[model samples]
Target chain A: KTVVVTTILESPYVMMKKNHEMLEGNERYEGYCVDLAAEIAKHCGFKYKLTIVGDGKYGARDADTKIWNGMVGELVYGKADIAIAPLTITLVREEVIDFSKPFMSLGISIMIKKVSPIESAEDLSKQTEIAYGTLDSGSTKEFFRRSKIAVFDKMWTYMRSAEPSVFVRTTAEGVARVRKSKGKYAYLLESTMNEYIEQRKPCDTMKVGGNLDSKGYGIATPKGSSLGTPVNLAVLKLSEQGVLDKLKNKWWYDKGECGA
Target chain B: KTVVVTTILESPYVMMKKNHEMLEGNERYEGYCVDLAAEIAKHCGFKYKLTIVGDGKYGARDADTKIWNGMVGELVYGKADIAIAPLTITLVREEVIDFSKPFMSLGISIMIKKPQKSKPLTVERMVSPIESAEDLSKQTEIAYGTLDSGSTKEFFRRSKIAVFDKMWTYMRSAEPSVFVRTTAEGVARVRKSKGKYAYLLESTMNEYIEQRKPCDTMKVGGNLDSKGYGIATPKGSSLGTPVNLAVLKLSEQGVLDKLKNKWWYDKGEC
Candidate 1:
């Protein structure tokens, strides 16, 4: 049976090529994750189909019903054989699905405009001058909501009830908000994405201070899926041989238009 | 023989006490360095006399005459047996005198008024986008200044980076020169200039000022460069080894940490 791989269309990760209109099947997409999925499929000796998660979400449990959404749900409900995207590994997600050892490590980071004065999350939380938020319905937001650390808890309180709604539905929206806020808005997202964006063209945004928390991204499979073992081993093997680092360099830095 | 230690009169480090009129000799002053001197003297089994440097400067070499000034000069001329203060260890001075292993670590940092705003200034009072030393060199809408004839100013002047080199050119020729003779005067310039001026100094002193009353100034951005303070002794002085060892012992025994807390954090007025 062909592996049904659920992924997301995020820049420099899994994105449609400019000439995608003339391509067919997986040829239509390319990025860090596209190259990664091809490598994993080649190693595992299985044909796979790349499918974007229909909900356009990063996965969150509904408060009242506790049903999972986004790419995570696609795997938990057996809608896809695996997930090959920048899906974060959280304890809540692990309860229902199995994740291979982390293929990539990252942490939540603060993104500010080139001229913004805010230095750290502590600065963001203590003042009202610059409005900030995270990607809605994602682990970044959930991390803040569930955080018990005093500073994080205080920030969650401010963000949860913030007027004019600080959160965004997608990373792109968050980046756009930061650029257009005229030094008045900050977006919190994964450091990898923030760093990647910092090297892209029109690089007016920067990662300020340090990461707020630490986490990683993993290739997720349904609980007890047999592919989980081989996939985890393949990721570890690729990581050990430096293929992952090379791929990251190719996507994030090789063609970088902006000076980092 | 008793060690004649020369130190500068800098706040929190060494300053006359409020009741100094009622005291004599060492009792006339108290501060971070005073306590440090007492500790080192005790540990090294030496009787010492604490004398303030007459010129009240941190120490610098005169370009034309090649003469060292301030507490460092006191030691070099054999007028004092040792120097104990925030006298930074620089290469030029190291050639002529010995410095114990660094007693403290710090870097040059930016100091600005609280709620600072940048020019082309916005209605909401936009802050200058200086997040690093590089940022300071990138733009010049607002002026950046440092202490005159101090280690920090010298660091920027001698730095090889394009930005810092450019900044040095601007600071060197800018009219009414930006260099201040003392850290307090620099802080006053930052506060009174509104958002027009930024003061650069060691992070230790910058942090101490950030917590003081009026609380109108803050340290922003990371340090531009790194350096440390070492106990100074004349070249090949027999006291060098014992002073270095005493500092090591005090640091290992948590004496340094306790002293910092007492002067900087414990008595924080703001």
Candidate 2:
């Protein structure tokens, strides 16, 4: 039986290989999460098909319909058996699905111009000279929306009402905005993504200051599924043996397009 | 239901209060592990009793005997509900029991005299004594042993790698006795024995002791391996689920990290 794994197409973690249209099925894709999926499948002794999520969203609930969308929805609707991506391990998602011990750690980070005068969230919140925003459908935005801290609360108020609609539909769009806006726009995104983009060509964008928060990415499976135990223990075993670290270095640095 | 938690009376994790004789039940003890147990129970929605392990051990098998001993045995024989301490999470233990997602990260480490030598890489340093586990195995001048009856010892005994296996051979039958009853005993040996003895224990405990009075000892070398300690429960226990989730919750919510600083560094002497 083939385990259908729900995933997202993202930089360094998962992406289409060159001439991907000519390649068939799993052969067309390669990246950190792809390698991780293979190791997981080999470790758990299961055959799995790598399937991109229907919705590009990282999985969030719609207030109007009270339904999940994105990769998280795939498992909820039984369209996929498991999910292996840079999917965050969040309390909300953990309530509806099972997650293994985290495979990697990440957090929300600010991406700004290398020469930008802005230093922190406080600076961004205080200035009307430079506008800042986050992905419309991601936890980075959700964090800002739900924040109680004075600075973050102020940040949320600004972005929610900023002219020209500051939010981006996707991570790529957010990076594009920052790159195009010069130093006028700072995009708040996952530290993982910001770091990945910072290393690419032109390298005009740099992740600034410390991460606003800290969390992890875990392999997600359906709630109460038998696969959870095997996957959970496998993550710990692989982590202990440094296999996860190896995979991360292999994809993020060894194959990096940017020079060290 | 009142949960029964098994832990050790080791330094900084669990310890006898100065006036412990007058205190009753949980109030008789206080330390890092005590605080951890309280937080775990509070989050998991259970009342718990703190019970010290009967053997005063960190849990291990006799090797010759098939039976387990210490906190592990307490859970195995249905004597305790769960374990919340500096107890290590090992693959062998994971097979028999369940563990929450790790609450703290640690690994086997070297504890040596502060006036002594080096540590794992940080760019530049002086000539190091026992720079790595490899050197510890290769060198003959200084002797080292893990605290007896714990994951550190079991790891050496069960390891198959060339360096570790050889090290185990030396420790299993060393002169006088490389093993000690408690971490305190091991630290005492390192302090008094000049440069001849090095205590091998978890990095968490080593770091805590490094900050304590005397500060005469420091942790040298990187961890022998990477691992973390999980709150343990018997296999198939319903409590395991909530306990597991609680750890992740506390960590994400930043409570566990806060408690760690409170117990480990807040009262540091050095």
Candidate 3:
């Protein structure tokens, strides 16, 4: 069975090929997420069609517009069977659908534009000298907003009330905002993506903090789907065999755009 | 308030003092297990009395005789509040008493008088053994037996029963007696009383003091079964939270044994 796998164009995860017309499914748009989806599908006895999301937006529940976009919308409206993107799990999203127990764990991190004297989460927490914002309507945003920890709780209060243009709409935008704004604006995001992005481009950015607290990205499926159980078991068995770790290494550091 | 704690007299778990006259309840023993029980009691807000089981035997159940004894017997019969010995978590024991999820884990291994010249059988190599646990019967020179306990009953039953026991008792039935009871006794008899009594015990205990003062025991042969050590509770007791927390703290502090030696097995390796 061909599974409709939805992913976003994040470097080292899913990215559009600079030379797509000459290649096929395995050849075109290849990256870490692409290869991982292929491997997981192979193990789970299904074929897949990869579609880069039309809008580069990661899902969010707009407080004013009351509309959904990105991977969450795709799953909620039955447009995709599984999303293998770097989708962070948050309580609000969790209430809408079920996520497999963290295939990969991460925490919100600050991606700095240039070298800063700030070295730790405590450094960021104690001072407003550097302005910080997360991708609006994403896990990093939710984590800070939802956390019971004092430092993060304070950080969340600042970000939630920050002006609209200041909050990033996507991970790429967040990184771009930080890179362009220099050391003035720090982008908050999942540490895995933050680390992967750090190894690329101007290479000016660096992730800081003792990881604001742990959260995991999961393969999300709509609630009460038949595939959830088998997929979960497959992930569990792969985790035990260290196959998932092997794939992460192969995709992120070896096969993807970033060369280790 | 002072609490009373019971323990078995195993070599490293509990060592005998030269000055027996000075020892009494709460003062008779000193080792890693003793230190651990004391440390846990201190952190958990309790004063405790320590006393060795009057019988020198560690917990065991002899199938031939069908009886119970030792610190384990105290737990089963309500003679003590808890046991601080090296106890194995087995299906048979779990049925009678509840065990906290492994305070420690170990494999039950066999000892061969003449260390086998063959390559060790790891899980990778055991894709297919000669046949079954009974395959032990075919090996004539090796005699195998287990520590007497509820753990042994189930281990011997579900496993390739006939061969394992046959291999064990056959050597145990040796003209001079190859069979022995208790891990310490087996190791001691094997070393000095040397007629080849091949001791069977937990690999954790074997690995603990093997590199220490006056150490003689060396684990050989392959483990027969995998198991864990648990802090057991009597049927429906309220001591689970306090005892379980104490076990975790003891584990974190690296003082769970009575030897005062570092049993630095990288628990994270598995």
Give the range of the ten consecutive residues with the poorest summed lDDT in model 2 chain A: A251-260
lDDT of 3 by residue, A92-176 (tens): 6655666653556666577786546888877786778778876765666655665566776788788766665577667777787
TM-score ranking of the models: 2, 1, 3
Candidate 3 ranges beyond 4 A from true positions: A24-26, A64-67, A148-150, A255-260, B1-270
How much of the real interface does each model capture, measured as fnat? 0.00, 0.11, 0.00
For candidate 3, lDDT tens digit of each residue in B127-226? Answer: 2222234455665554445554435533544443455556545644656554455665666665663333445567766665454445444455565544
Tell me each candidate's TM-score: 0.51, 0.83, 0.50
Q: Write down the RMSD of all candidates, one decimal each.
A: 16.8, 4.4, 13.4
Candidate 3 C-alpha error for residue A186, in Å: 1.4
Model 3 interface RMSD, one decimal: 11.7
> Each prediction's Cα lDDT score?
0.80, 0.80, 0.63
Tens-place lDDT per residue, model 2, B82-101, is 88877777767777778776
Per-residue accuracy of model 1 over A1-260 as CA lDDT, tens digit each: 88899998898898798988788988998998998899999899999999998879888898899898888888888889988898886666766887665556677788887645666778788987778888888887777887666788888887888989888988998898888897788787898898888988699888888866556687889988999767876775565445776788899889888875
Per-residue lDDT value at A138 in model 1: 84
* Cα displacement (Å) at residue B149, model 2: 4.1
